[PDB]
Symmetry: D2
């Protein structure tokens, strides 16, 4: 009798009121009985059609539900096994829900994430880091099996044209987004605005236990992403992106890959197929990204950033390896060592 069962029965009802009259015609009443009764004889069935006929007026869904719930929970469940097979969903869709706890630009501000199970309606808090899938996987993959997958979830921490340095709080339960703290106050970029959507990939971690080719360990954070599309995102907004390449930034002695990606919703996504297409269609974009990350902390007392491969942006095949490997590291962190907070 739970809300999940009610939705199943609601879809069942629609198969007998396809045109949404709002009620069951007499013919439809006999038909839903012939259907529910399929794993019965007439003993429990005779009692069923007689019961529904004795309802007063139009058999609305609401009255049909009432009739259904009035039966004994055991006998219901026998025929319900058929109903459930035909009318339950393949999987329960989870709606990502975002809530703010004010006040923005002060240390108290948080962006919290929840799941709303669309079948049960139950809400639970989740971690944008651990619980948002890194890979966007269709239940039924219709794109041809030849073309390989390139659809990643990107969590936007810092929208295009802004400079409040929001971050997934790796140290707090459920890892809400917060504003980073620098010199005791909420941190704003001093160098200038972030000129692309900036954020991170969920279910990745720049491991402090891994010696990257560059001779350093990781910066202890989710893998960083720069989304170069034309649309400004909201803080905490999550959207599907295509990975194009990656910059081997070494930041304060830690590996700090910067993945270049573009929203699958951008008008030029189709035409950007690897890192080399970015100079062709967005000349100066890669140079500006490399330079911004090279110098941005200098005005803050830091030093110029170093880069592996002499600052070369590696291609997408390489970037997806980097992401895959940080997914493994994240598996080791959360699944194996049970660390949900740093």
């Amino acid at each position: 009798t739970q809300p999940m069962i009610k939705k199943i029965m609601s879809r069942l009802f629609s198969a007998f009121d396809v045109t949404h009259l709002g009620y069951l015609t007499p013919d439809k009443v006999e038909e839903v009985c012939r259907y529910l009764g399929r794993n019965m004889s007439d003993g429990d069935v005779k009692a069923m059609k007689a019961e529904i006929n004795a309802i007063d007026g139009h058999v609305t869904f609401e009255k049909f539900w009432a009739w259904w719930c009035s039966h004994p929970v055991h006998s219901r469940t026998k025929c319900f096994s058929m109903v459930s097979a035909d009318f339950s969903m393949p999987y329960h869709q989870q709606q990502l829900v975002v809530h703010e706890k004010g006040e923005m630009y002060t240390p108290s501000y948080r962006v919290l994430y929840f799941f709303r199970d669309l079948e049960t309606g139950r809400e639970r808090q989740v971690s944008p880091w651990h619980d948002i899938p890194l890979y966007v996987r269709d239940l039924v993959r219709t794109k041809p099996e030849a073309t390989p997958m390139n659809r990643y979830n990107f969590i936007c921490e810092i929208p295009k044209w802004t400079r409040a340095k929001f971050e997934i709080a790796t140290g707090e339960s459920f890892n809400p987004i917060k504003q980073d703290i620098k010199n005791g106050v909420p941190r704003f970029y001093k160098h200038g605005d972030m000129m692309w959507n900036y954020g991170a990939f969920p279910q990745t971690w720049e491991s402090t236990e891994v010696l990257f080719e560059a001779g350093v360990t990781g910066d202890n954070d989710p893998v960083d992403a720069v989304e170069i599309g034309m649309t400004q995102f909201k803080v905490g907004q999550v959207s599907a992106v295509k990975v194009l390449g990656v910059l081997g930034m070494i930041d304060e002695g830690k590996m700090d890959w910067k993945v270049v990606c573009i929203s699958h919703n951008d008008p030029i996504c189709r035409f950007m197929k690897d890192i080399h297409d970015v100079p062709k269609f967005l000349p100066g974009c890669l140079d500006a990204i490399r330079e911004w990350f090279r110098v941005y902390k200098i005005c803050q007392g830091g030093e110029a950033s170093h880069f592996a491969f002499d600052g070369e942006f590696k291609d997408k095949e390489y970037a997806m390896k980097v992401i895959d490997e940080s997914h493994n590291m994240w598996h080791n962190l959360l699944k194996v060592n049970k660390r949900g907070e740093l």
Copy 2:
């Protein structure tokens, strides 16, 4: 010990070889034992670490698999419950696979559909009509809960700029795509080429038992769709589309809605938000569609088509109602009345 278990263990292994060295270092050997052994003491554990140390040379995944499979299937399963929770997929992705049975443009030609379970690797034949989801539902829905869904699977039967009249064979098991037969020969449009991708929505049916507002029943086929993007699709190709509106075509006395939609991969999808945007950005497109469907059978001995609403293209809210209701009709056809073939 099945292929599904092997993939689970392969992802497990990667969490202890994150950098893909191809083997387990000594430290990693102790760690995978501390992990597998978490629901054990030392009795079954002592036997475990001793067993893995006694492997010769580098513990490759292949040797790790061998060691794992050599244990007694019961004791394995106790710790495996933990492994399965951490490293099994949320759901099994199904790869849509298409096979042709030649020869094209003859009556023998068929396009068959299969599912390849990507975890088990098992293939089964499926119906493009019944088994391809009508609605494209993300497991975790990241688009904000306010913006409503508009992502439908479109099965292309007739590609842009062609005239071989392929159709889902509603009368055959597994409903392969075939070429329609007219006057004893494989059917080609006489009027001209189809100038947009033409096909159908899976899990819909223009019910022969429903009296549509127009005073007729349906044409006994899946709901028809015209995809107006610039890209030509392959025969049988399935892709995600956005519904914009619908034309109330009455064809030979049957309701024969023609849904106007556009590929979510087209460069101008973002800008087309309802049926009214089509004349703005694709002037003449709606007029040509209405006219082509109005007259195309006349040169074949048929009559001009009629249209409800005096030929008005209804908007997307209306088109999605039409699609929703034909989904209900399809539920009644397949689930309730158990008809997989017409």
Copy 3:
């Protein structure tokens, strides 16, 4: 006193009524006299200011014009050389004007072209064939001198998705567009609709006096163009296109090049840089174009079309050479031999 002179004086007037009060303030009246009066005697300047101050009410432009036209043709002549240098246009822009003489789809239908000189206001009829520039040349070319030009005027005779075979009438004075006549009636394609904007390049001619490399002479018509953008054009509409390549069609034994081009207003024009990009971004488009032109006359009793280079689409460099050479032929036809009608 021409309307041309009036517009010059209107622009002069605006330079002293910059915010468009609609009239001259006293200080502005003194300033326009000091301007008109260099280099004249103080006698003529003071008398000039006096003539204008003696105007009744507000010195609107319309009254300023009146004063000017009443002024003596002598004093005018000396300063007007200055005025003309400062305020005359570099060249007179001609506005293309299109008029129909009904009735459409009958032999009487004509689309006529005119020029309206925006400075003199005089309208004169012109030939879309002879008088519309083949090359679109900016007065000041701002694109870098490195980038070679690829901006051509395309005259649409047959809009996307239509089949009325309109044509520039090479045989009639001013070469209006008419519907071709086949078998005594206005001609419609029997094969199907034209699925791209179809038309011709002005100031070109497939010479009947030239033996093309293919061993045949030309089809005696302007060079044919297929514009593959997503937007449908109106009959007779002229717009700027980018040339991509050309198909060496031989039609009924005559050279009948089919240039592939795309509108500079199309959303994907920037990404289409040569003929090879068409299969990348519009798969099937080239094949469909070749096939349509190969077979369309067969159903009319004609023969399959032939193609040079085995049906290969030559690239944009080759296509521009063909166009340049047909431009030379047109120069010989019109300028040298004075043939405006065939």
Copy 4:
């Protein structure tokens, strides 16, 4: 005998060597004499053909030119009026040429502009401010007379994602672009990078003699433009833009309009039709522009900028009026008062 005459004769030559054999066949030699010779005596035509036939080897253009230049200035004069009418260009296209005088980021750096007359080949230095047309006007306007014009030349001083404050030097002859000087050194924005292409409209001037509606005079500079397309421009690059709206910025007590525009080469230009479409397709763009200009000088010791209309972005109709009026002011500055340098 000018290089201008040589190009005329080159085009004439091509009209008799249409396929570019590179020389004149005998029949073509007779034909060019019959052309040049109307209307002359048979004596002069036969002697002319004889002069050219008496040429050694193949009559290439280069030798044809030689023959022409040696011909007697009398006979030339009579036919050349015909030649000039048939083969001279409507107007001489000027190619914009840009030269740097290093060294960049020092006070010595200059970007100079030239015109190369494509017919005469003569190069002369020009002012990007005065000599580049504000309005982009086609010789033959093919867009329908209904559509009003919205095609302006934009001079980029500060490319997208940069912060070197380059400026048209209003104080120097020919008004080269230089880096602004602030506090004795070449000026860089302290606030951050300019996140859109920034520059100015040629042939405009924010007059110091005009009391703007806001109750202040102008900032004595060309009108400022922010180009919001996705493509980064080079310093000094000139390109055609579509005007969308304008921000009524008051900067240090002076009127300092900020016109919002977008490149006619941008993929989404067609879809942006007025200022209201910018929030539809580039959310946050307007807010970010207003805010950047509001605060950027504060970190330099300056004050927040003021805005007329409470910071509202006025629409494109209003923006074009502002531009038209600043064009009038520029006419008064340059043409009437002869001020090319401030």
